[PDB]
């Protein structure tokens, strides 16, 4: 429904910004059931929440 709390908790646990927080757009009702950081950790372990990779900024041109 509205996953602002879930995004904030995921960014807190994952130690990354909200930019890198990826929630599964399919299992919205499953993620919305998460209201504790333990539940967020369990969801991260189960693969519903994934830390997105850092945006690529290569230095090959510089080198």
């Amino acid at each position: 429904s509205m996953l602002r709390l879930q995004k904030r908790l995921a960014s807190s646990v994952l130690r990354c910004g909200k930019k890198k927080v990826w929630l599964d757009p399919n299992e919205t009702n499953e993620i919305a059931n998460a209201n504790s950081r333990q539940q967020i950790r369990k969801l991260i372990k189960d693969g519903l929440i994934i830390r997105k990779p850092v945006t690529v900024h290569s230095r090959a041109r510089c080198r």
Binding site: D46, G47, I50
Partner: protein, 31 residues
């Protein structure tokens, strides 16, 4: 195990973005 029906739909779930984005690793349910 993997068969043709399972593979053709697996390609969908592992792709969570366009070219240049990381692939999905797992989606495991456990109660």
């Amino acid at each position: 195990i993997m068969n043709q029906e399972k593979l053709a739909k697996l390609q969908a779930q592992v792709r969570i973005g366009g070219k240049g984005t990381a692939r999905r690793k797992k989606k495991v349910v456990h109660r």
